C-alpha cells in the first residue's frame, strides 16, 4: 500500500475489508472489522497487534472476550492497583482450580483462597504452611489433629522470597499509556 486513502477509493465485504485490515493494517477497518470478525484467531493475534500499534485501553476489551483472562489479570497486577484482579480471581476460582490460586496470592498478602484451598488439600498441611503468619497456624492444626495427624517431617521452606515491587509515587503505573505517532 501507499495510504489507506486508497482503501477508501475502493474496498468491500467484511471479509475483504478484513484482508485490508491486515494489508493496510487498516485497523480502523479493523475495529469494526473485528466487531464483525469473529474468526478468533483473527482477533487473537490482533488485539496484541492492536496494542502493538497502540491502546491497551481498548486492547483489554479485545482480550476480554478472548479469554486471555490471566493475561489481563497480569496487566492488572503489573500496574499497581488491586481490585480487578480480585474479581477476576473470584470468577475463575469460581470456575474450579488445582494450580492457579497462586495467581491471587503473591501480590497480595491475605488470601481467601485458603478457605477453598484446604478443601482441595484438606490435609491441614497446606493449611498450616499457609496459615501460620496471619497468626493463624492454629486452625490448620485443629483439623490436623482431628484427623489423626500425618505430618512428621518438612523441607526448607520458611517464607524467604520477596513479594515486593510496584509503584510508590513519582514515575507511574500505567493504567493508560500515552504515546504519539511522532
Amino acid at each position: 500500500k501507499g495510504y489507506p486513502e486508497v482503501a477508501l477509493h475502493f474496498v468491500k465485504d467484511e471479509k475483504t475489508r478484513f484482508s485490508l485490515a491486515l494489508e493496510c493494517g487498516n485497523i480502523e477497518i479493523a475495529l469494526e472489522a473485528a466487531k464483525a470478525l469473529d474468526d478468533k484467531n483473527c482477533w487473537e493475534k490482533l488485539g496484541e497487534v492492536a496494542l502493538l500499534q497502540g491502546n491497551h485501553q481498548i486492547v483489554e476489551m479485545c482480550y476480554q472476550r478472548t479469554k486471555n483472562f490471566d493475561k489481563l489479570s497480569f496487566l492488572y497486577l503489573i500496574t499497581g492497583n488491586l481490585e480487578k484482579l480480585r474479581k477476576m480471581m473470584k470468577i475463575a476460582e469460581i470456575r474450579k482450580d488445582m494450580s492457579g490460586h497462586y495467581q491471587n496470592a503473591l501480590y497480595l498478602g491475605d488470601v481467601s483462597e485458603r478457605v477453598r484451598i484446604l478443601k482441595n488439600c484438606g490435609q491441614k498441611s497446606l493449611a498450616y504452611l499457609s496459615a501460620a503468619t496471619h497468626g493463624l497456624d492454629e486452625e490448620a492444626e485443629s483439623l490436623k489433629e482431628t484427623f489423626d495427624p500425618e505430618k512428621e517431617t518438612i523441607p526448607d521452606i520458611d517464607p524467604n522470597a520477596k513479594l515486593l515491587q510496584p509503584p510508590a509515587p513519582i514515575m507511574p503505573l500505567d493504567t493508560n499509556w500515552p504515546l504519539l505517532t511522532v
Binding site: 515486593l164 514515575m171 504519539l180
Partner: protein
C-alpha cells in the same frame, strides 16, 4: 519348617513365593524375602520403609522412580527427604507446590537457575517477581521478545528501563517503519516521563521501604515470617 527350606530356595523362587506372600498379605515378610529391584520397589511403595526404600533406590536410576516415589513420600509427609529426592529428581512442579506453600528464597535461587531452564517464558517471570526482582523479570523479557509487556513492568514499578527499553522496542517498530509505527518520547512531548511526575519511583517512601523489605509486616504470625501486601500497604505506599 519352611525356613530350613528357605536356604534351599534362591533367586527366582523367592520371587514367586514372594508374590504368594504378598498374597498372604505378609507384606513385611514379603519384604524380607524381597528379591527384585522392581519387586522390591513396588512392594516398597506398599510398604513404605522410607529410608529403606531409598537404599533400594540407592541411586534410583530413574526419575520415574522418583516421581512415583515422590507422590508416595509426600503422602507419608516425609518431606525433608522428599525434597531431597524430588530435588534429586529436580522435578520442579510438585516440589514448587510445597516450597511455595511455606515459601522460600533459597528454593527460589536454585529454582531460578531452574527457571532459566524451563523453556516457556511465563513461569520464570513469576519467580522473578516472587523473589522480587524486576531486574530479573526484565532480563528475562530481553531474551523472549516480550517487548510491549516489558515496557509495562519497566514503567509500573520503575526501573526506568521504560526509557531504555522503549527505544529498542520502538526501534523494532522503527524497522517496521511508518512514523506512527516508530512512535517517540521520554521526558517530554509524547510522554513527559519524569516531567509527568507520578507513581513508580523516588527516595522517601523508598527509604521506608528499604527497611520494609527487611522487616516482617506483622499482624500476628509464626517463625515463618510476615510481609502482608494489602490495604495498608496501599496507604503507606502512597505516603
Amino acid at each position: 519348617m519352611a525356613d530350613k527350606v528357605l536356604p534351599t530356595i534362591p533367586k527366582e523362587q523367592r520371587t514367586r513365593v514372594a508374590h504368594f506372600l504378598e498374597k498372604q498379605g505378609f507384606k513385611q515378610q514379603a519384604l524380607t524375602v524381597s528379591t527384585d529391584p522392581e519387586h522390591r520397589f513396588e512392594l516398597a511403595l506398599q510398604l513404605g520403609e522410607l529410608k529403606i526404600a531409598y537404599q533400594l533406590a540407592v541411586e534410583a536410576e530413574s526419575e520415574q522412580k522418583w516421581k512415583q516415589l515422590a507422590e508416595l513420600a509426600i503422602s507419608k509427609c516425609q518431606f525433608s527427604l522428599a525434597q531431597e529426592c524430588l530435588h534429586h529428581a529436580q522435578d520442579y512442579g510438585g516440589l514448587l507446590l510445597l516450597a511455595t506453600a511455606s515459601g522460600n528464597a533459597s528454593m527460589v535461587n536454585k529454582l531460578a537457575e531452574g527457571a532459566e531452564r524451563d523453556g516457556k517464558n511465563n513461569v520464570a517471570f513469576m519467580s522473578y517477581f516472587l523473589q522480587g526482582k524486576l531486574d530479573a523479570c526484565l532480563e528475562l523479557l530481553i531474551r523472549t521478545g516480550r517487548l510491549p509487556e516489558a515496557a509495562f513492568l519497566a514503567r509500573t514499578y520503575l526501573p526506568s528501563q521504560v526509557s531504555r527499553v522503549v527505544k529498542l522496542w520502538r526501534e523494532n517498530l522503527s524497522k517496521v517503519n511508518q512514523k506512527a509505527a516508530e512512535s517517540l518520547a521520554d521526558p517530554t512531548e509524547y510522554e513527559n516521563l519524569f516531567p509527568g511526575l507520578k507513581e513508580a519511583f523516588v527516595v522517601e517512601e523508598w527509604v521506608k521501604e528499604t527497611h520494609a523489605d527487611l522487616w516482617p509486616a506483622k499482624q500476628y504470625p509464626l517463625v515463618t515470617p510476615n510481609e502482608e501486601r494489602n490495604v495498608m500497604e496501599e496507604a503507606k505506599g502512597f505516603q
